[PDB]
Amino acid sequence: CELTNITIAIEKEECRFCISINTAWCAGYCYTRDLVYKDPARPKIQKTCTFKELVYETVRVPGCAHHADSLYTYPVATQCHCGKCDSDSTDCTVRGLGPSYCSFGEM
């Protein structure tokens, strides 16, 4: 579970386009076991690659026809480990849209 450079995608709903920032985040492998004996008394969250520390940033997002280009603040991974995704800040899913998902036009 290193900490590698990926390519997130920031978008302006109003302008039908997206910009590509090259920020750094988490990814890699972690160890887990599927208990052969499952005690009814849950649980054991199981570890996973994620963030330990995340500093924020901001960037310039071009505007267009009828909107002034603005500022966008995005999280950046400081250090990665195999902890337990912090539900109080993270949407822990099996499969998400992906860091570079661009929904040019909402809905």
Partner 1 sequence: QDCPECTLQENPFFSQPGAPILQCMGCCFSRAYPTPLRSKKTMLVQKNVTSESTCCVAKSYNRVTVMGGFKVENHTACHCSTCYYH
Ligand X SMILES: *[C@@H]1O[C@H](CO)[C@@H](O[C@@H]2O[C@H](CO)[C@@H](O)[C@H](O)[C@H]2NC(C)=O)[C@H](O)[C@H]1NC(C)=O
Chain residues binding partner 1 by CB under 8 A are 1, 6, 8-9, 11, 13, 23, 25-39, 42-46, 48-51, 54, 74-75, 77, 80, 82, 85, 89-99, 101-103, 106
58 binds ligand X, rule: CB under 6 A: no
Instruction: Quote the tokens at residue 66.
Output: 């009828």
Residue nearest to ligand X (CB): 5
User: If you ran DSSP here, which 8-state letter would residue 17 be given?
Assistant: E
What are phi and psi for residue 57, nearest 5 degrees? -145, 175
32 touching ligand X, by CB under 6 A: no
Query: Which residues, other chains included, contact 21 with Cβ-Cβ below 8 Å and sequence gap of 6+?
Result: 7, 8, 9, 10, 59, 74
Instruction: Determine, following the binding rule CB under 6 A, whether residue 24 of this chain makes contact with ligand X.
Output: yes
Q: For residue 101, what are its two tokens?
A: 């998902």
Residue 24 interacts, among partner 1, ligand X, none and using kind-specific CB cut-offs from 5 to 8 Å, with ligand X
Q: Residue 48 Cβ, how far from ligand X at the closest point, in Å?
A: 19
DSSP result, 45-66:
----SEEEEEEEEEEEE--BTT
By the criterion CB under 6 A, which residues form the site for ligand X? 4-5, 24
